[PDB]
């Protein structure tokens, strides 16, 4: 097992064709999950499934620069289920991050932070148990 919050180092940051794979299980009474692609204390890409925001399931994606959150990107397609195993894949593409859950494409998030090499850490937090987190260039 892996400790949560988990820090997956990205020495030399993200680069196109980098495939990050995370394997785990959502906890039985999960409230939220978060992946944080960090550039120091800024968050180039925050991917946040909320099991209950205003009584609705939603994935909120955003960038935090200099302590302030920008323009939220929201989507109602929500494949995570409490108590069930998951596989998240994040494929870094030239102009966006592609996100797939359990081999099904979920969403993409266009790069706001364009200096990709400075996005040096992936924080993985929230209501999950984690078994694997790594990346391979494809
Ligand atoms: C309203 C509102 N309700 N939530 C948010 C923030 O929305 C952001 C996206 O826009 C991030 O999701 C922030 N966030 C979530 C977490 C996290 C997630 C986890 F799952 C865990 Cl486990 C964990 F510990 C931590 N840390 N920071 C979250 O606090 N905002 C919001 C939205 C905007 Cl655009 C601007 C300002 C706010 C503010 F926070 F000030 F209120």
Swiss-Prot record:
Q: Where is this motif: Nuclear export signal?
A: 114-129
Any single biological process term in GO: monocyte chemotaxis
Can you name a GO cellular component term?
ficolin-1-rich granule membrane
- Annotated residues that bind a beta-D-galactoside are located at 69-75
Q: Where is the Galectin domain?
A: 6-136
Q: In which tissues is it expressed?
A: A major expression is found in the colonic epithelium. It is also abundant in the activated macrophages. Expressed in fetal membranes.
Q: Which domain of life is it from?
A: Eukaryota
Instruction: Quote the range of the complete protein represented.
Output: 113 to 250 of 250
Give the main location: cytoplasm
Tell me where it resides.
Answer: Cytoplasm; Nucleus; Secreted
Keywords noted in UniProt: Acetylation, Cytoplasm, Differentiation, Disulfide bond, IgE-binding protein, Immunity, Innate immunity, Lectin, mRNA processing, mRNA splicing, Nucleus, Phosphoprotein, Repeat, Secreted, Spliceosome
This protein is called Galectin-3
Q: Which GO terms describe its molecular function?
A: carbohydrate binding; chemoattractant activity; disaccharide binding; IgE binding; laminin binding; molecular condensate scaffold activity; protein phosphatase binding; protein phosphatase inhibitor activity
